[PDB]
């Protein structure tokens, strides 16, 4: 793991790099001096094609890359609730904080959550249970309404050896389970790389229609818990209301808001207005029920493919946890035009009007992450995402 | 020998060293399996080589053998009748071979039958000098067909001893003393595809086929000798038009090359053309026809050789004194190969990809086409009538296939999608094709029928582009503004759309029209016009002519399913229309 | 380590890989790719040169590194272990079981590439299918052993089209209930969902195999998957003697993943950048189809496919329709208007209609009064169409006519319900009360005989 | 000095390599294998390689045992008076089976530029006997006035005419017709010429025939 790459390209955010013979397809990167975050995403003897999600302004031939030897990933634990973060999972006000500035630096790296947070964890479950992946060993009350229920995670199977109630970090154990291949800990927090979905039992048919409140949408076009609506509309003709008004009124579980390559101010609006929303039976406001992902127009551009992954891997992890999950993506032409972006510097050949031949397959995969599902687990919940995409044509 | 060392396997490419020895156009045995390919490039000792068979299975270092021999056909008695794939193997022997329902690979099978016995009768005396083309005898292949023995190529000496008898293709029936020795004769030569087979004179193709097609017959005619490609969409009636040509047209010997098509057709062929007899004749079409098939998912680089095998087949008939036509279903299919294997040897795409050298394939095939005076001392003459079908991407014609094929050939038949979707077959849009035959055609035509046929023709085409005006008026000002005169035009230009150019193929007399049936159907189409536009002067009105003529308006309409032997019934409707618009006149 | 492993991967790109310093790879040849983690990963040698393979792999790259993962070449093609026990049972895109059932034992393994049918071989294709649909019985015949697509657009009902097609479909004779198979190429959980749930609830599923690539499945598999079924197909039909109904959907995906193929191996594109071999390789799957002389067995086709923007020129359905033997296309016009099924009959097409219809196999009056019924259908669109330019008053009477068949004609005839399987001879019949509308002399089609015997 | 180097053929393009001392538009010679000539015009030159067009197409040429011969000078006609009365193809070809013209001298056909200053106005009445055109659209000498037509309408017969009628009333055994055909109908072509030799106006013309079913790239030439 000591391997150190070398620039020998610069090309917006399209970075070549030699010498990076020892890191893998999908790993992240530290690029050049600056160290910005960047992404492997192709490999041509040493010589990685590397996607990089802040400005490369001032970064040249003959400086560093450092592989971290993990892939794009999220952490996923308490904390998360009410937090607005950037396409990687970087939690803006921590970013403000931490840089002394209200602007948006760069080569920044932060933890997504606080680990030094302490949190009350409620055991449930008892000692020599047998578990496997998403049985639930207990929870902590985030939320006076979201439980946030903590699930063994995937690839952990064994038997349930100590177990503690007790304040904790999310970085403490606080389960110990008999595996196979040996003792392993558990903590409250679970990274999950954003380009798999996450695992399920099984899907199920989305009958329920939502409450939109929207009485054009409930009446002659409604949408189920666990399917999907596109919004294509020219500029101007509402998208982004009708996003906030089904983050407002709709009767899901959570909200997960990607502000894909669209305006700051909208996304300052939301985190401004939301904590002002309470409901009348629980006494809890609407950011409390809430997580925005944030990458605008001027935001480095393949941060916007980011932005999608973090959002909907987000929205599964609280699915797993038999929630229902609305998740808006405003707007998904943002993201396909960061795809053509790239594909354009990486000279691939172009699918249709210059869009990469991917393009269909990669909004067919991220569709089919929505849905009603039995999630993972001997309990066998049920959990959905309702998917509701704006899209922007020229 | 020299064996030769795979290096590389790209799909229908293989390329292999240590091939010095071997030279382009050699046949080779490539890989374990010995699949069966030809050298397309040589540099050095690498060879390129394009195989005819599927390559899954193979890689490099694996042998590989150049027979010395280009791809060939044999042509001798046993061709006729039979039903090929792309590199002549028949596909009755290959079933029988292998054993299977299924093409296997590696199979190598002679051509023809080797061990029949044929009876040869000798028409020639000894003693009588002769050279290429000059026929020895021949053997009554079928009903027929007389296959004529004709002494091959290279060939030029004296007679010394020849008997007719009952032979094999492989048995020495004649032995000719030239200035390099003595040589013998077999009933069989073999010729390479991609040399044309030499003529003495290239003649000027200007005797209308009668392809019992009325459409293209009397508005888009093609020549003995002449070229036509039938560019449509998908499902607008090429292989229909081919098969119709295939099966009625007056030529001596039919070529269908199935080239990247649909099984089932050629299925269709073999299984249909034994049972099309005529029942005085008792002779069926399989008689007069050779089949070669490589399906569309058979190995690609076989359709440019299934090409070359059928236009050398028709060339050797052609060189006997016979008419033949070679249909190719469908063009583009080779161009497809050509892009293929353009693409696996990296060299520069064109046009849509296809290689650079598209145009000019194209020329060499339409090239070897035409009316000709063939070798020999009876100075005998033959033609090879190419019909081929494109099929343009989208429909669109401009596409480099039809664009390419257009340059060279002299009848386009553009079929039309909105003509087939009103059921209009042949969907051939008669104000966008044409044949530059037309003019001789109408001259030849006017002489053997003694006939005013080429007023008639240029009368009905008249017709037709006035109604494509008028129709852009009725649009522009609407239908009631027309002229009793107009609606009259509309009215026999409806007929000749439904009377005459409209021909179900699949209806037992619709089918085939002769050459006397079509002028009598538009002679009395014609005749309606104009005793009815006579009628209008005379002070009727069209509603009142129209009212006064639904009885006789039938008789044209039902004159296409008159029989061939009851014409009179045709031409007496001309009677019947003067004496009904005689009557309506006279009130 | 049974087979030698190669840590010679020197190139990954997309579905693309290279690997070095190999001998006695062959084309075509599976390849494994074994990775750190102990995941097993499948591919295919797309060329060989030298020492050097250049692989796509199916379940992509994500991950590969040229130290962690070994590749090992398995020396032979890929293959389906196929076996009579695959019928009533549910595959992935590379024909593993997916359904939780008991493990099943191959009777042998088959290149799923398969073989071509030597077309003197073939048994023409003439036994009339009933499907209970009238615009495809009398308009679109369709017989057993024939390939007959069904062109659709994204939102319109083609899956409701091809469940009641195999809900309904038989022939006329005494031979066994077709057995299904079933290909799902890149579609949805609720598209492959609504299959399941009709083929479980008419039993059907009992005589079905199924081989599912859902959206969520990695895109390259898509090219294996259809290539799967066809060879299961032709196993249950000429070797087991089944007659086989391939229904796979939706071929749009399949050509997009091998438009993503070409496209990473830099090929030179045809029109909309989908490879220059898109016909032929389309063809080595929808030519596998039909009968066999001398074998009891059958395989006929449905496959589906969305044309893009309702764009018929597109090359997906364009070349298709040069492949299939007719098409069944559905319009969005006739959607809108409650149309069920919402063909439209101008457009479609069957070519294996002359010898499966007439006397001794459906009735005597099948091909003209199709004709006749196409032919006056043609003109009231058309007359429907100036009425709508030029509004009713510009119309004649006789175009008046027309258009009001035309009407009755979707609406009567075309429009029969996705639950309704009619008799070859109700279907007959409704299209003489249709013809009754027209004055008998516009009937220019259909002989005096059989006017005079059929015609009210 | 023939190459032998043909490279390849693209329609009535060829590409021609290994050549040196060639210039743009520089008149070519394809000796073909059957023995026949096709003329041909530099169209691009670069290096050793020179990309050219031939006027008769490239079918039928095999392009490795054909030849190429550059002529050192452009295209060019050879002009004479005697060209009155005679009939040639596009090409310059004479078509009325009459004797080879003895030229004068050869012209380059793209000609040259009039100096605008040695230019003289277009003046004095051309009578073509049509009256619309005659009174209401006069033609005078050295203008340009074309006919702006659709097929089916009858140009041909306006153009027969105007070429039979067309008189200066100045001067006198003066004037001169010379009818360019392009692409045009067997049948059109039968129609002017029996119009020109019956009428006698072909005793005062120079025609130069290109017909439909002539190579395509010999009407670049025939206007020049
Ligand atoms: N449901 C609504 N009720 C009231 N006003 C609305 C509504 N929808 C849209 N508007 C008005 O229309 C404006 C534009 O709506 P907005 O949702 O921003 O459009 P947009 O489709 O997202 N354009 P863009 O972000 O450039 O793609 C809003 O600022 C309101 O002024
Ligand atoms: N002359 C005809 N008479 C009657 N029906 C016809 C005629 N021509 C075509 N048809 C009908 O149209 C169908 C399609 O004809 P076909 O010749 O197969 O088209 P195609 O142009 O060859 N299509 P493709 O092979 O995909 O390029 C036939 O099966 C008939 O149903
Ligand atoms: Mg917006
Ligand atoms: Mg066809």
């Given at each position: 793991?000591?391997?150190?790459?070398?620039?020998?390209?610069?090309?917006?955010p399209?970075?070549?790099?030699?010498?990076?013979?020892?890191?893998?397809?999908?790993?992240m990167?530290?690029?050049?001096?600056?160290?910005?975050?960047?992404?492997?995403?192709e490999?041509?003897?040493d010589?990685?094609?590397?996607?990089?999600?802040?400005?490369?302004?001032?970064?040249?031939?003959?400086?560093?890359?450092?592989?971290?030897?993990?892939?794009?990933?999220?952490?996923?634990?308490?904390?998360?609730?009410?937090?607005?973060?950037?396409?990687?999972?970087?939690?803006?006000?921590?970013?403000?904080?931490?840089?002394?500035?209200?602007?948006?630096?760069?080569?920044?790296?932060?933890?997504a959550?606080?680990?030094?947070?302490?949190?009350?964890?409620?055991?449930?479950?008892?000692?020599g249970?047998?578990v496997?992946?998403?049985?639930?060993?207990?929870?902590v009350?985030?939320?006076?309404?979201?439980?946030?229920?903590?699930?063994?995670?995937?690839?952990?199977?064994?038997?349930?050896?100590?177990?503690?109630?007790?304040?904790?970090?999310?970085?403490?154990?606080i389960?110990?389970?008999?595996?196979?291949?040996?003792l392993?800990?558990?903590?409250?927090?679970?990274?999950?790389?954003?380009?798999?979905?996450?695992?399920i039992?099984?899907?199920?048919?989305?009958?329920?229609?939502?409450?939109?409140?929207?009485?054009?949408?409930?009446?002659?076009?409604?949408?189920?818990?666990?399917?999907?609506a596109?919004?294509?509309?020219?500029?101007?003709?509402?998208?982004?209301?009708?996003?906030?008004?089904?983050?407002?009124?709709?009767?899901?579980?959570?909200?997960?808001?990607?502000?894909?390559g669209?305006?700051?101010?909208?996304?300052?609006?939301?985190?401004?207005?939301?904590?002002?929303?309470?409901?009348?039976?629980?006494?809890?406001?609407?950011?409390?029920?809430?997580?925005?992902?944030?990458?605008?127009?001027?935001?480095?551009?393949?941060?916007?493919?980011?932005?999608?992954?973090?959002?909907?891997?987000?929205?599964?992890?609280?699915?797993?946890?038999?929630?229902?999950?609305?998740?808006?993506?405003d707007?998904?032409?943002?993201?396909?035009?960061?795809?053509?972006?790239?594909?354009?510097?990486?000279?691939?050949?172009?699918?249709?009007?210059?869009?990469?031949?991917?393009?269909?397959?990669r909004?067919a995969?991220?569709?089919?992450?929505?849905?009603?599902?039995?999630?993972?687990?001997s309990?066998?919940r049920?959990?959905?995402?309702?998917?509701?995409?704006?899209?922007?044509?020229? | 020998?020299?064996?030769?060392?795979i290096?590389?396997?790209?799909?229908?490419?293989?390329?292999?060293?240590?091939?010095?020895?071997?030279?382009?156009?050699?046949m080779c045995?490539?890989?374990?399996?010995?699949?069966?390919?030809?050298?397309?490039?040589?540099?050095?000792?690498?060879?390129?080589?394009?195989?005819?068979?599927?390559?899954?299975?193979?890689?490099?270092?694996?042998?590989?053998?150049?027979?010395?021999?280009?791809?060939?056909?044999e042509?001798?008695?046993?061709?006729?009748?039979?039903?090929?794939?792309?590199?002549?193997?028949?596909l009755?022997?290959?079933?029988?071979?292998?054993?299977?329902?299924?093409?296997?690979?590696?199979?190598?099978?002679?051509?023809?039958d080797?061990?029949?016995?044929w009876?040869?009768?000798?028409?020639?005396?000894?003693?009588?000098?002769?050279?290429?083309?000059?026929?020895?005898?021949?053997?009554?292949?079928?009903?027929?067909?007389?296959?004529?023995?004709?002494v091959?190529?290279?060939?030029?000496?004296?007679?010394?001893?020849?008997?007719?008898?009952?032979?094999?293709?492989?048995?020495?029936?004649?032995?000719?003393?030239?200035?390099?020795?003595?040589?013998?004769?077999?009933?069989?030569?073999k010729?390479?595809?991609?040399?044309?087979?030499?003529?003495?004179?290239?003649?000027?193709?200007?005797?209308?086929?009668?392809?019992?097609?009325?459409?293209?017959?009397?508005?888009?005619?093609?020549?003995?000798?002449?070229?036509?490609?039938?560019?449509?969409?998908?499902?607008?009636?090429?292989?229909?038009?081919?098969?119709?040509?295939?099966?009625?047209?007056?030529?001596?010997?039919?070529?269908?090359?199935?080239?990247?098509?649909?099984?089932?057709?050629?299925?269709?062929?073999?299984?249909?053309?034994?049972?099309?007899?005529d029942?005085?004749?008792?002779?069926?079409?399989?008689?007069?026809?050779?089949?070669?098939?490589?399906?569309?998912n058979?190995?690609?680089?076989?359709?440019?050789?299934?090409?070359?095998?059928?236009?050398?087949?028709?060339?050797?008939?052609?060189?006997?004194?016979?008419?033949?036509?070679?249909?190719?279903?469908?063009?583009?299919?080779?161009?497809?190969?050509?892009?293929?294997?353009?693409?696996?040897?990296?060299?520069?795409?064109?046009?849509?990809?296809?290689?650079?050298?598209?145009?000019?394939?194209?020329?060499?095939?339409?090239?070897?086409?035409?009316?000709?005076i063939?070798?020999?001392?009876?100075?005998?003459?033959?033609?090879?009538?190419?019909?081929?079908?494109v099929?343009?991407?989208?429909?669109?014609?401009?596409?480099?296939?039809?664009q390419?094929?257009?340059?060279?050939?002299?009848?386009?038949?553009?079929?039309?999608?909105?003509?087939?979707?009103?059921?209009?077959?042949?969907?051939?849009?008669?104000?966008?094709?044409?044949?530059?035959?037309?003019?001789?055609?109408?001259?030849y035509?006017?002489?053997?029928?003694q006939?005013?046929?080429?007023?008639?023709?240029?009368?009905?085409?008249?017709?037709?582009?006035?109604?494509?005006?008028?129709?852009?008026?009725?649009?522009?000002?609407?239908?009631?503004?027309?002229?009793?005169?107009?609606?009259?035009?509309?009215?026999?230009?409806?007929?000749?759309?439904?009377?005459?150019?409209?021909?179900?193929?699949?209806?037992?007399?619709?089918?085939?029209?002769?050459?006397?049936?079509?002028f009598?159907?538009?002679?009395?189409?014609?005749?309606?016009?104009?005793?009815?536009?006579?009628?209008?002067?005379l002070?009727?009105?069209?509603?009142?002519?129209?009212?006064?003529?639904?009885?006789?308006?039938?008789?044209?309409?039902?004159?296409?399913?008159?029989?061939?032997?009851?014409?009179?019934?045709?031409?007496?409707?001309?009677?019947?229309?003067?004496?009904?618009?005689?009557?309506?006149?006279?009130? | 380590?049974?087979?030698?492993?190669?840590?010679?991967?020197?190139?990954?790109?997309?579905?693309?890989?290279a690997?070095?310093?190999?001998?006695?790879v062959?084309?075509?040849?599976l390849?494994?790719?074994?990775?750190?983690?102990?995941e097993?990963?499948?591919?295919?040698?797309?060329?060989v040169?030298?020492?050097?393979?250049?692989?796509?792999?199916?379940?992509?790259?994500?991950?590969?590194?040229?130290?962690?993962?070994?590749?090992?070449?398995l020396?032979?093609?890929?293959?389906?272990?196929?076996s009579?026990?695959?019928?009533?049972?549910?595959?992935?895109?590379?024909?593993?079981?997916?359904?939780?059932?008991?493990?099943?034992?191959?009777?042998?393994y088959?290149?799923?590439?398969?073989?071509?049918?030597?077309?003197?071989?073939?048994?023409?294709?003439?036994?009339?299918?009933?499907?209970?649909?009238?615009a495809?019985?009398?308009?679109?015949?369709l017989?057993?052993?024939?390939?007959?697509?069904?062109?659709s657009?994204s939102?319109?009902?083609?899956?409701?089209?091809?469940?009641?097609?195999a809900?309904?479909?038989?022939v006329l004779?005494?031979?066994?209930?077709?057995?299904?198979?079933?290909?799902?190429?890149?579609?949805?959980?609720?598209?492959?969902?609504?299959?399941?749930?009709?083929?479980?609830?008419?039993?059907?599923?009992?005589?079905?195999v199924?081989?599912?690539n859902?959206?969520?499945?990695?895109?390259?598999?898509?090219?294996?998957?259809?290539?799967?079924?066809?060879?299961?197909?032709?196993?249950?039909?000429?070797?087991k003697?089944?007659?086989?109904?391939?229904?796979?959907?939706?071929?749009?995906?399949?050509?997009?993943?091998?438009?993503?193929?070409?496209?990473?191996?830099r090929?030179?594109?045809?029109?909309?950048?989908?490879?220059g071999?898109?016909?032929?390789?389309?063809?080595?799957?929808?030519?596998?189809?039909?009968?066999?002389?001398?074998?009891?067995?059958?395989?006929?086709?449905?496959?589906?496919?969305?044309?893009?923007?309702?764009?018929?020129?597109?090359?997906?359905?364009?070349?298709?329709?040069?492949?299939?033997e007719?098409?069944?296309?559905?319009?969005?016009?006739?959607?809108?208007?409650?149309?069920?099924?919402?063909?439209?009959?101008?457009?479609?097409?069957?070519?294996?209609?002359?010898?499966?219809?007439?006397?001794?196999?459906?009735?005597?009056?099948?091909?003209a009064?199709?004709?006749?019924?196409?032919?006056?259908?043609?003109?009231?669109?058309?007359?429907?169409?100036?009425?709508?330019?030029?509004?009713?008053?510009?119309?004649?009477?006789?175009?008046?006519?027309?258009?009001?068949?035309?009407?009755?004609?979707?609406?009567?005839?075309?429009?029969?319900?996705?639950?309704?399987?009619?008799?070859?001879?109700?279907?007959?019949?409704?299209?003489?009360?249709?013809?009754?509308?027209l004055?008998?002399?516009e009937?220019?089609?259909?002989?005096?005989?059989?006017?005079?015997?059929?015609?009210?």
């Open positions: 793991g000591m391997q150190i790459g070398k620039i020998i390209k610069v090309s917006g399209l970075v070549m790099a030699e010498n990076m013979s020892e890191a893998s397809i999908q790993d990167c530290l690029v050049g001096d600056l160290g910005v975050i960047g992404e492997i995403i490999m041509r003897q010589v990685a094609s590397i996607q990089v999600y802040e400005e490369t302004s001032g970064i040249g031939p003959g400086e560093p890359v450092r592989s971290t030897g993990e892939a794009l990933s999220v952490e996923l634990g308490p904390g998360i609730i009410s937090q607005m973060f950037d396409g990687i999972q970087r939690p803006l006000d921590t970013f403000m904080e931490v840089t002394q500035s209200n602007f948006l630096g760069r080569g920044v790296q932060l933890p959550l606080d680990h030094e947070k302490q949190w009350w964890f409620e055991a449930t479950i008892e000692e249970t047998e496997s992946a998403g049985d639930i060993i207990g929870y009350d985030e939320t006076k309404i979201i439980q946030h229920k903590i699930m063994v995670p995937n690839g952990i199977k064994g038997t349930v050896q100590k177990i503690e109630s007790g304040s904790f970090t999310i970085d403490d154990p389960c110990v389970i008999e595996t196979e291949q040996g392993k800990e558990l903590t409250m927090m679970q990274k999950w790389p954003v380009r798999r979905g996450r695992p039992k099984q899907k199920l048919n989305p009958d329920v229609p939502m409450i939109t409140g929207q009485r054009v949408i409930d009446t002659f076009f409604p949408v189920t818990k666990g399917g999907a596109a919004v294509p509309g020219p500029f101007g003709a509402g998208k982004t209301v009708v996003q906030h008004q089904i983050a407002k009124w709709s009767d899901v579980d959570l909200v997960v808001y990607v502000g894909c669209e305006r700051g101010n909208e996304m300052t609006d939301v985190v401004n207005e939301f904590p002002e929303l309470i409901d009348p039976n629980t006494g809890e406001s609407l950011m409390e029920r809430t997580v925005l992902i944030a990458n605008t127009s001027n935001m480095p551009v393949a941060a916007r493919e980011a932005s999608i992954y973090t959002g909907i891997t987000i929205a599964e992890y609280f699915r797993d946890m038999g929630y229902d999950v609305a998740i808006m993506a707007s998904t032409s943002r993201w396909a035009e960061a795809l053509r972006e790239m594909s354009g510097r990486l000279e691939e050949m172009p699918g249709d009007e210059g869009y990469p031949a991917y393009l269909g397959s909004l995969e991220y569709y089919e992450r929505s849905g009603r599902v039995i999630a993972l687990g309990d066998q049920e959990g959905s995402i309702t998917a509701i995409s704006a899209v922007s044509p020229s | 020998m020299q064996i030769g060392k290096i590389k396997v790209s799909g229908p490419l293989v390329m292999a060293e240590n091939m010095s020895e071997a030279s382009i156009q050699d045995l490539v890989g374990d399996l010995g699949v069966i390919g030809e050298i397309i490039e040589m540099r050095q000792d690498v060879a390129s080589i394009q195989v005819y068979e599927e390559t899954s299975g193979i890689g490099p270092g694996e042998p590989v053998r150049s027979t010395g021999e280009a791809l060939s056909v042509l001798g008695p046993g061709i006729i009748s039979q039903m090929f794939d792309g590199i002549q193997r028949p009755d022997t290959f079933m029988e071979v292998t054993q299977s329902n299924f093409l296997g690979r590696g199979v190598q099978l002679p051509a023809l080797h061990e029949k016995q009876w040869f009768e000798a028409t020639i005396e000894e003693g009588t000098e002769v050279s290429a083309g000059d026929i020895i005898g021949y053997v009554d292949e079928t009903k027929i067909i007389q296959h004529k023995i004709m091959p190529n290279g060939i030029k000496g004296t007679v010394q001893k020849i008997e007719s008898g009952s032979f094999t293709i492989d048995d020495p029936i004649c032995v000719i003393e030239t200035e390099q020795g003595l040589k013998e004769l077999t009933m069989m030569q010729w390479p595809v991609r040399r044309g087979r030499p003529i003495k004179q290239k003649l000027n193709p200007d005797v209308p086929m009668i392809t019992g097609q009325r459409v293209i017959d009397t508005f888009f005619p093609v020549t003995k000798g002449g070229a036509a490609a039938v560019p449509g969409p998908f499902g607008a009636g090429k292989t229909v038009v081919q098969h119709q040509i295939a099966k009625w047209s007056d030529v001596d010997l039919v070529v269908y090359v199935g080239c990247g098509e649909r099984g089932n057709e050629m299925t269709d062929v073999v299984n249909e053309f034994p049972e099309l007899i029942p005085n004749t008792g002779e069926s079409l399989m008689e007069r026809t050779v089949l070669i098939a490589n399906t569309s058979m190995p690609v680089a076989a359709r440019e050789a299934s090409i070359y095998t059928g236009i050398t087949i028709a060339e050797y008939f052609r060189d006997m004194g016979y008419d033949v036509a070679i249909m190719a279903d469908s063009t583009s299919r080779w161009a497809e190969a050509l892009r293929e294997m353009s693409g696996r040897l990296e060299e520069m795409p064109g046009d849509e990809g296809y290689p650079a050298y598209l145009g000019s394939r194209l020329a060499e095939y339409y090239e070897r086409s035409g009316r000709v063939a070798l020999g001392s009876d100075q005998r003459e033959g033609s090879i009538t190419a019909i081929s079908a099929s343009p991407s989208g429909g669109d014609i401009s596409e480099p296939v039809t390419n094929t257009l340059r060279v050939v002299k009848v386009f038949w553009g079929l039309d999608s909105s003509l087939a979707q009103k059921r209009h077959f042949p969907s051939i849009n008669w104000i966008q094709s044409y044949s530059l035959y037309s003019t001789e055609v109408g001259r035509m006017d002489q053997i029928l006939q005013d046929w080429s007023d008639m023709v240029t009368e009905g085409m008249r017709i037709l582009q006035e109604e494509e005006q008028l129709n852009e008026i009725v649009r522009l000002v609407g239908i009631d503004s027309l002229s009793d005169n107009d609606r009259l035009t509309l009215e026999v230009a409806k007929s000749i759309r439904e009377d005459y150019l409209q021909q179900n193929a699949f209806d037992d007399v619709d089918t085939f029209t002769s050459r006397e049936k079509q009598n159907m538009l002679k009395v189409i014609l005749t309606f016009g104009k005793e009815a536009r006579k009628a209008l002067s002070g009727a009105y069209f509603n009142e002519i129209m009212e006064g003529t639904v009885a006789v308006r039938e008789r044209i309409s039902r004159s296409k399913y008159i029989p061939e032997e009851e014409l009179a019934k045709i031409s007496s409707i001309n009677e019947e229309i003067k004496e009904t618009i005689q009557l309506i006149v006279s009130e | 380590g049974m087979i030698k492993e190669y840590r010679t991967i020197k190139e990954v790109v997309g579905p693309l890989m690997v070095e310093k190999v001998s006695g062959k084309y075509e040849e390849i494994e790719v074994r990775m750190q983690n102990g097993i990963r499948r591919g295919q040698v797309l060329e040169q030298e020492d050097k393979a250049m692989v796509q792999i199916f379940e992509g790259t994500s991950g590969i590194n040229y130290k962690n993962s070994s590749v090992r070449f020396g032979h093609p890929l293959q389906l272990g196929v009579e026990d695959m019928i009533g049972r549910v595959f992935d895109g590379l024909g593993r079981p997916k359904d939780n059932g008991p493990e099943i034992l191959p009777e042998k088959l290149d799923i590439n398969g073989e071509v049918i030597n077309p003197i071989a073939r048994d023409y294709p003439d036994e009339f299918i009933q499907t209970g649909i009238s495809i019985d009398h308009l679109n015949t017989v057993r052993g024939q390939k007959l697509p069904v062109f657009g939102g319109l009902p083609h899956k409701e089209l091809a469940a009641q097609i809900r309904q479909a038989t004779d005494s031979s066994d209930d077709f057995a299904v198979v079933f290909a799902a190429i890149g579609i949805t959980f609720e598209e492959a969902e609504f299959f399941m749930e009709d083929f479980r609830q008419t039993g059907a599923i009992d005589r079905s199924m081989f599912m859902l959206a969520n499945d990695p895109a390259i598999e898509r090219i294996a998957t259809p290539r799967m079924a066809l060879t299961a197909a032709e196993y249950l039909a000429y070797e003697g089944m007659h086989v109904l391939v229904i796979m959907t939706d071929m749009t995906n399949y050509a997009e993943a091998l438009r993503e193929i070409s496209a990473a191996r090929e030179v594109p045809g029109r909309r950048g989908y490879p071999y898109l016909y032929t390789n389309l063809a080595t799957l929808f030519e596998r189809a039909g009968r066999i002389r001398g074998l009891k067995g059958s395989v006929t086709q449905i496959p589906i496919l969305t044309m893009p923007e309702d764009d018929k020129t597109h090359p997906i359905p364009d070349l298709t329709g040069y492949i299939t007719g098409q069944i296309i559905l319009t969005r016009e006739l959607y809108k208007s409650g149309i069920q099924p919402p063909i439209d009959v101008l457009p479609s097409l069957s070519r294996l209609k002359d010898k499966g219809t007439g006397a001794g196999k459906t009735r005597e009056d099948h091909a009064t199709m004709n006749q019924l196409f032919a006056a259908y043609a003109q009231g669109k058309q007359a429907k169409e100036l009425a709508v330019v030029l509004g009713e008053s510009a119309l004649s009477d006789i175009d008046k006519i027309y258009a009001k068949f035309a009407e009755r004609f979707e609406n009567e005839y075309v429009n029969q319900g996705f639950y309704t399987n009619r008799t070859i001879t109700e279907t007959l019949d409704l299209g003489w009360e249709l013809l009754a509308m004055p008998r002399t009937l220019k089609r259909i002989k005096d005989d059989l006017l005079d015997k059929y015609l009210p």
